[PDB]
Short mmCIF file of C-alpha atoms and ligand atoms in Angstrom, two decimals:
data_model
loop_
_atom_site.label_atom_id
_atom_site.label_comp_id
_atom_site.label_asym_id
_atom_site.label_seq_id
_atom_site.Cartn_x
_atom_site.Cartn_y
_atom_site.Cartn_z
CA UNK A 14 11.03 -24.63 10.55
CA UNK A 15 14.50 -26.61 10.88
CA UNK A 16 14.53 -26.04 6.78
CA UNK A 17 14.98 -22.42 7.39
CA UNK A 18 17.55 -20.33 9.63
CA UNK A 19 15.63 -17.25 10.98
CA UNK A 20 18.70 -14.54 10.96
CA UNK A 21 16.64 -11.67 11.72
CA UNK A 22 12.96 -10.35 12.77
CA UNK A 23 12.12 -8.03 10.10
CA UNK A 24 9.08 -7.24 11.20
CA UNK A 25 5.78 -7.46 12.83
CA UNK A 26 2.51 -7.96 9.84
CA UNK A 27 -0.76 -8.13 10.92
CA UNK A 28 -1.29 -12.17 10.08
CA UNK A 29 2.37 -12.83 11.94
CA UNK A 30 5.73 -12.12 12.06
CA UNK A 31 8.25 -11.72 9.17
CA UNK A 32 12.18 -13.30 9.59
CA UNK A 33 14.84 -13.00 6.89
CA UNK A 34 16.00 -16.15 6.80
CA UNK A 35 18.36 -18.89 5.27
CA UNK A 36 17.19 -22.16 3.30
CA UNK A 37 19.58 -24.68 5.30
CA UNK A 38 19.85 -26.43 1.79
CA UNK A 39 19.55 -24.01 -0.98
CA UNK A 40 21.63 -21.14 0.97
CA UNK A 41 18.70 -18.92 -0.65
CA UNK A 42 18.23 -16.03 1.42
CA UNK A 43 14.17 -15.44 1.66
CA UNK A 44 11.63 -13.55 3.95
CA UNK A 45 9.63 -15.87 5.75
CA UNK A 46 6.36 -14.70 7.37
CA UNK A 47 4.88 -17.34 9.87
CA UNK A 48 1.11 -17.23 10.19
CA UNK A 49 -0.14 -18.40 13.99
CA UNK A 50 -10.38 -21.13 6.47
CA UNK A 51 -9.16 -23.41 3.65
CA UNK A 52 -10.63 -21.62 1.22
CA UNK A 53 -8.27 -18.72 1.67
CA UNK A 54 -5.32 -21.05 1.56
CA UNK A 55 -6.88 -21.52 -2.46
CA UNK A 56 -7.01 -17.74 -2.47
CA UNK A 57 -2.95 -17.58 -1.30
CA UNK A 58 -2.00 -20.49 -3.67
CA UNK A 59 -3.63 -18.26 -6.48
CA UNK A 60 -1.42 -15.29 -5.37
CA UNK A 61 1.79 -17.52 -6.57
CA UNK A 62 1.07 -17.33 -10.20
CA UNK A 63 0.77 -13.29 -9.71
CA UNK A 64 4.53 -12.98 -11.84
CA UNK A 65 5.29 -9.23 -12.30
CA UNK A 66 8.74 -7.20 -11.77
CA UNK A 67 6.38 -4.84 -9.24
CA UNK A 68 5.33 -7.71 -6.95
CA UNK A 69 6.68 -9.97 -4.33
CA UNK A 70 7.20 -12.60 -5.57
CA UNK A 71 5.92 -15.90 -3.06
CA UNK A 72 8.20 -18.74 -3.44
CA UNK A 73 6.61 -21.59 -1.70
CA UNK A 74 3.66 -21.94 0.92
CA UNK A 75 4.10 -24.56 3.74
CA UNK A 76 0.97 -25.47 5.78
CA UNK A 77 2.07 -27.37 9.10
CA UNK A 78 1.58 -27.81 12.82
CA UNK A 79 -1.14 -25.41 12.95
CA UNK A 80 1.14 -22.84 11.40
CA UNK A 81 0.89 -21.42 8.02
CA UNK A 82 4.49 -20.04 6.37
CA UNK A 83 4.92 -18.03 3.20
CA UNK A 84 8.10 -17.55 1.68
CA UNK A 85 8.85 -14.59 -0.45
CA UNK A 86 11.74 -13.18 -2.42
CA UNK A 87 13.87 -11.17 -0.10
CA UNK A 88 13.94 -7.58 -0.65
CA UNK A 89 16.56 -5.19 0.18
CA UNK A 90 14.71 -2.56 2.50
CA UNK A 91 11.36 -1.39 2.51
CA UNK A 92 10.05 2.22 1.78
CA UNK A 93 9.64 3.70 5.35
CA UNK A 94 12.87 2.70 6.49
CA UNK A 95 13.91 4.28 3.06
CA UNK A 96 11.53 7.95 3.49
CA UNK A 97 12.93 8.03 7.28
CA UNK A 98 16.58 7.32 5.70
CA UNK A 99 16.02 10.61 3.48
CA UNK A 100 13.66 12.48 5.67
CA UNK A 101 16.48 15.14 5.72
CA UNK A 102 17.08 16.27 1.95
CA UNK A 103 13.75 13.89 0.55
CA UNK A 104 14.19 11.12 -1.84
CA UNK A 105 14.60 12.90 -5.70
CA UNK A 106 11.45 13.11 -7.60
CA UNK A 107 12.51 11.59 -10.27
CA UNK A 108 13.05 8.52 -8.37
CA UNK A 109 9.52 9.41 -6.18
CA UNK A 110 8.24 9.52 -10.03
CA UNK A 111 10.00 5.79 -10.93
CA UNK A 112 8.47 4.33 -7.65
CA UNK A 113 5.40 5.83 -8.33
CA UNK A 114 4.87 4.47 -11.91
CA UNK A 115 5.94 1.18 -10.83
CA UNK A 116 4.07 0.73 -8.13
CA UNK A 117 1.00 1.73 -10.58
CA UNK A 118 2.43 -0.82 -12.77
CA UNK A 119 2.21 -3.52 -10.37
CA UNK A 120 -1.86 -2.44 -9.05
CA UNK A 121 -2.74 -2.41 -12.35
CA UNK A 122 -1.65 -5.67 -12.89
CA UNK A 123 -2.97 -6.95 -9.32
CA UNK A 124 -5.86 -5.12 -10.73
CA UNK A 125 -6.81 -7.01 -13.94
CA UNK A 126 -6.11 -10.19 -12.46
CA UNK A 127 -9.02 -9.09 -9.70
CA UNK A 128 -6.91 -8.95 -7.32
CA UNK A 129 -6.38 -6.21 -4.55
CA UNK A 130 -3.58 -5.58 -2.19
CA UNK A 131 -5.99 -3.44 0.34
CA UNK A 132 -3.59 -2.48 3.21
CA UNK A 133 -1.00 -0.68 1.05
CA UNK A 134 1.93 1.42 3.45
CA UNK A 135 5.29 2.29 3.01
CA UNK A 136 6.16 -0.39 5.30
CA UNK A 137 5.36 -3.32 2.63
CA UNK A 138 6.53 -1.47 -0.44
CA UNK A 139 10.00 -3.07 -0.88
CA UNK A 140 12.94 -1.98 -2.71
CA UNK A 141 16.22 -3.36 -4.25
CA UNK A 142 19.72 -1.74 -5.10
CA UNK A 143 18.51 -1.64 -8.66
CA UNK A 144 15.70 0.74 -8.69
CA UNK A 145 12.75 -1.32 -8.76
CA UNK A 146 10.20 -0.94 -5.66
CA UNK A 147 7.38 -4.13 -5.31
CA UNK A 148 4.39 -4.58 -3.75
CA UNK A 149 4.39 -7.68 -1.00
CA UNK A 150 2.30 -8.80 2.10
CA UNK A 151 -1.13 -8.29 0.24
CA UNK A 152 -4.16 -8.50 2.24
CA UNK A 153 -6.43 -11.38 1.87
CA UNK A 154 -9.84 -10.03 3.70
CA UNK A 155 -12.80 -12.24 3.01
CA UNK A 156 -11.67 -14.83 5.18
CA UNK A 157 -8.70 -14.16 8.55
CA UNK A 158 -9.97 -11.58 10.16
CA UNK A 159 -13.91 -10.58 11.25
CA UNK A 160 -0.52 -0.93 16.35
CA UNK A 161 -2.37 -0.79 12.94
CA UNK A 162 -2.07 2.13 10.89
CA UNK A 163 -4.92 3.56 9.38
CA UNK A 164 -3.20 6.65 7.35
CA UNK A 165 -3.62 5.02 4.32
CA UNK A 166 -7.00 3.23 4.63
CA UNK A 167 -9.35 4.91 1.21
CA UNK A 168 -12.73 6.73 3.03
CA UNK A 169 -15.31 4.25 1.76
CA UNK A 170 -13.95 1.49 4.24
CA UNK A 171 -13.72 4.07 7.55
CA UNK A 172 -17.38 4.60 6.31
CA UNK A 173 -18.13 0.67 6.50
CA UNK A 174 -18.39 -0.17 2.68
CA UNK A 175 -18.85 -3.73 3.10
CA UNK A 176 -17.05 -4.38 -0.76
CA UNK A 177 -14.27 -2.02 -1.77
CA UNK A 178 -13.03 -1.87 -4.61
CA UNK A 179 -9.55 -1.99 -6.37
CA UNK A 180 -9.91 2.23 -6.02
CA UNK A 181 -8.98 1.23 -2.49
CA UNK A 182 -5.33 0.73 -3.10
CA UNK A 183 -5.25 3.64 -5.58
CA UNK A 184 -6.07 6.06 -2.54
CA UNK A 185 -3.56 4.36 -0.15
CA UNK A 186 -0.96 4.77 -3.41
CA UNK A 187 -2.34 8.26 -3.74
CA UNK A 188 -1.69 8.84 0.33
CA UNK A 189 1.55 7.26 -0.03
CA UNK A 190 3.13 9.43 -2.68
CA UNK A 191 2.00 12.87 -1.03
CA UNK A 192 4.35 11.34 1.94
CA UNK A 193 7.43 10.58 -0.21
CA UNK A 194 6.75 14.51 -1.53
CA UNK A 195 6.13 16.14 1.90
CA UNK A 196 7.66 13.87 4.14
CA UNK A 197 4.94 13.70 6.24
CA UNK A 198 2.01 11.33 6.32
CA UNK A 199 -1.24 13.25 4.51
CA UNK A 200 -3.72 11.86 6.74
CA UNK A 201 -1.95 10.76 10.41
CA UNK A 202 -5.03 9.66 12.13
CA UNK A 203 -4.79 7.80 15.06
CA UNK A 204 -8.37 6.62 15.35
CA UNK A 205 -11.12 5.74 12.47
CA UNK A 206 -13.05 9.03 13.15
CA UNK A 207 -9.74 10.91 13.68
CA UNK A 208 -8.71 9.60 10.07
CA UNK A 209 -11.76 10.21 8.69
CA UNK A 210 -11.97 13.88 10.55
CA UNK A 211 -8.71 14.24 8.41
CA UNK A 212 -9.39 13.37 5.19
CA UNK A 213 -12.26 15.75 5.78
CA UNK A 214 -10.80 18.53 6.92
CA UNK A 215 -8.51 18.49 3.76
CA UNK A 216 -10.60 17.32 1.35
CA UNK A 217 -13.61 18.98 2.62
CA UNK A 218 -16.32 17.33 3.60
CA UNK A 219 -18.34 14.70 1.44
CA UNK A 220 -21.58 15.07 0.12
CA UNK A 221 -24.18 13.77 -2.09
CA UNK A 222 -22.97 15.97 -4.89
CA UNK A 223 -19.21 14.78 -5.22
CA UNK A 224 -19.63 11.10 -3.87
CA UNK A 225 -23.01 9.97 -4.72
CA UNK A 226 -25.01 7.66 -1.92
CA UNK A 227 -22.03 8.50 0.74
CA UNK A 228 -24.77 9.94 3.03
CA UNK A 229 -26.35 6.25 2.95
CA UNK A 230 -22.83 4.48 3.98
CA UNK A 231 -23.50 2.32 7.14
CA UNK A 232 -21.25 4.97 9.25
CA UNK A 233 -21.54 8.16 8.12
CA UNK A 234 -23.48 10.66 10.46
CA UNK A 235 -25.76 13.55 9.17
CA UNK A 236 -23.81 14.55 12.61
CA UNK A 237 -20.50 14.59 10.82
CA UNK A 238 -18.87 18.57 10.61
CA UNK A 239 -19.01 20.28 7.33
CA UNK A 240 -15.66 21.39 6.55
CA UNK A 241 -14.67 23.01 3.17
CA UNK A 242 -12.24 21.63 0.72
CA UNK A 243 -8.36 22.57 0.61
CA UNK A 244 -6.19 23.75 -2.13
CA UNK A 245 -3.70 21.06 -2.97
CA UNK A 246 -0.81 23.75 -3.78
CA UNK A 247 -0.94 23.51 0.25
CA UNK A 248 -1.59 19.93 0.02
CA UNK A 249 1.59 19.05 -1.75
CA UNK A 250 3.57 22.56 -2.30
CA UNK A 251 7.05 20.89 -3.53
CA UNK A 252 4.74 18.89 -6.15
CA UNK A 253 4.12 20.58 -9.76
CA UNK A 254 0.69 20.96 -11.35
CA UNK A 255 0.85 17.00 -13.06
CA UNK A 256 1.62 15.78 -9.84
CA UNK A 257 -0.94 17.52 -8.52
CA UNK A 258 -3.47 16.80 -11.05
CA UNK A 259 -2.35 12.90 -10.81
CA UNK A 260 -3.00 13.02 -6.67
CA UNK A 261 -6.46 14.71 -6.98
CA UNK A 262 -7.67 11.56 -8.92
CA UNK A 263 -5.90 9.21 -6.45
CA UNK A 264 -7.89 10.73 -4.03
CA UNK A 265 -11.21 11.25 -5.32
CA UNK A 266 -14.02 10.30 -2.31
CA UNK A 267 -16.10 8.65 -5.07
CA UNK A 268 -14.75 4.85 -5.58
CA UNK A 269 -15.88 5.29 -9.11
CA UNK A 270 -14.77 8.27 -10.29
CA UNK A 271 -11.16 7.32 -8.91
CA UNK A 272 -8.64 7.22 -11.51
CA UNK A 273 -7.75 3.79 -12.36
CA UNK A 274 -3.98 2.18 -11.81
CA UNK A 275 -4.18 1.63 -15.60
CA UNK A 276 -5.33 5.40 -16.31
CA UNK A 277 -3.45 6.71 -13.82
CA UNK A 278 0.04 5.38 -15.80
CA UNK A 279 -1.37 7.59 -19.28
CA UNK A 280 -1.01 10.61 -16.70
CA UNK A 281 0.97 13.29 -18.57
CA UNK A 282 2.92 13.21 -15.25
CA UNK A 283 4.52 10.50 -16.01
CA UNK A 284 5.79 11.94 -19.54
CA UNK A 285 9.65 11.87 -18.68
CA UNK A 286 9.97 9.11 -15.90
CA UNK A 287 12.72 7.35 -16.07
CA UNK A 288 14.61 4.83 -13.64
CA UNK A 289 16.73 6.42 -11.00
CA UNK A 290 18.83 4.06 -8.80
CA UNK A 291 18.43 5.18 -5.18
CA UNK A 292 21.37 5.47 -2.16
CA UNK A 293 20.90 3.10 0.15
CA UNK A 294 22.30 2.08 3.08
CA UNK A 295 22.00 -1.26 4.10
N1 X36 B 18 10.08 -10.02 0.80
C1 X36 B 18 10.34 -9.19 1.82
N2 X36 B 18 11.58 -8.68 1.98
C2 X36 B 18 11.64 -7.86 3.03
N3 X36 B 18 12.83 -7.24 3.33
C3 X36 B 18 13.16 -6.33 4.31
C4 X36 B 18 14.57 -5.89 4.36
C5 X36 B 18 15.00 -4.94 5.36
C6 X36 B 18 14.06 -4.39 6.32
C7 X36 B 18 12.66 -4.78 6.30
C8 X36 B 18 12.21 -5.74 5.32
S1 X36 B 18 10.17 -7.70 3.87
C9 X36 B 18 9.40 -8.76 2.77
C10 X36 B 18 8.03 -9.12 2.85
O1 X36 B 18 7.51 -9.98 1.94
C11 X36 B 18 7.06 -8.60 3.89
C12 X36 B 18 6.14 -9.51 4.60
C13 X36 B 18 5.21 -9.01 5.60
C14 X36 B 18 5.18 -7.59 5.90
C15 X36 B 18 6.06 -6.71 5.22
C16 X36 B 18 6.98 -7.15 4.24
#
């Protein structure tokens, strides 16, 4: 757009490309991502009255010339570049605790407005100077659609669930803090069956006893191996028992019995967060 001065390609989403950019009149600095039904265009409008300290928040959306642009709030740096920046010592967990809760805070506002993020990675989890980390590019689904990471996808959609739920984002948040803590991915597949082979072999195989009507999912296999379940104090070792307790709900196989974004923040784990600000370099 000639209202906007692309200063940098911050990255590469799945619906287009993200610049930081300049409003030629304003002198706001944004992040612009440039797209290329209708319906869907309602469903983006609708994501501009989402107002919460935790999300993104989308400034204006500009339908022209065949191209779709949504401008957003400019963040700082995002969360991978962030985990790779402290890959050597790990980010504190009191501040892995702050992001944590916050992030929570924003799902289970998402959450109660019906609303789901569904492609949740440390990539679009964006953080500021001040401490505050926010959720941005959320999925639509249900209409753009019918290279890209599936470490964080929840098992009901590599088993073809045709309508997750919000527990979807709760097990990519789940996946997501086990990473900060380890600092390594939980679940690095590089296929759909490799991802789901590794949430297996972790979490043990499902079955009709802890995830109910999972042997009736449109992909699952009676052909599938039957691996048995893994202690989580190899899991997450550095992690301490609340932690741990927390995770295990984030990453229940059954949608349903999934701790909820809203539960999930009564978690005694979260007892004495508080609001680190983090080092970074930008
Ligand atoms: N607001 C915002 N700031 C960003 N800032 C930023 C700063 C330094 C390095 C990378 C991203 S990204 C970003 C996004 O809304 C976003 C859009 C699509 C995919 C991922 C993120």
């Amino acid at each position: 757009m000639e209202n906007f001065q692309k200063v940098e390609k911050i990255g590469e989403g799945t619906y287009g490309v993200v610049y930081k950019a300049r409003n030629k009149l304003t002198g706001e600095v944004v992040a612009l991502k440039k797209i290329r039904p209708s319906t869907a265009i309602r469903e983006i409008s609708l994501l501009k009255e989402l107002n919460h300290p935790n999300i993104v928040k989308l400034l204006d959306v500009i339908h022209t010339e065949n191209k779709l642009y949504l401008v957003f709030e400019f963040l700082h740096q995002d969360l991978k570049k962030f985990m790779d920046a402290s890959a050597l010592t790990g980010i504190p967990l009191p501040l892995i605790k702050s992001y944590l809760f916050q992030l929570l805070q924003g799902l289970a506002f998402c959450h109660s407005h019906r609303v789901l993020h569904r492609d949740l990675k440390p990539q679009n989890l964006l953080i500021n100077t001040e401490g505050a980390i926010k959720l941005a590019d959320f999925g639509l689904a249900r209409a753009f659609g019918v290279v890209v990471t599936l470490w964080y996808r929840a098992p009901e959609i590599l088993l073809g669930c045709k309508y997750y739920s919000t527990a979807v984002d709760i097990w990519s948040l789940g996946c997501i803090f086990a990473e900060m803590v380890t600092r390594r991915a939980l679940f690095p597949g590089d296929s759909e069956i490799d991802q789901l082979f590794r949430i297996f072999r972790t979490l043990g195989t499902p079955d009709e006893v802890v995830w109910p009507g999972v042997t009736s999912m449109p992909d699952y296999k009676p052909s599938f191996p039957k691996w048995a379940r893994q202690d989580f104090s190899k899991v997450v070792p550095p992690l301490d028992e609340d932690g741990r307790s927390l995770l295990s709900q984030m990453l229940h196989y059954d949608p349903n019995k999934r701790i909820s974004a809203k539960a999930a923040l009564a978690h005694p784990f979260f007892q004495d967060v508080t609001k680190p600000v983090p080092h970074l370099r930008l």
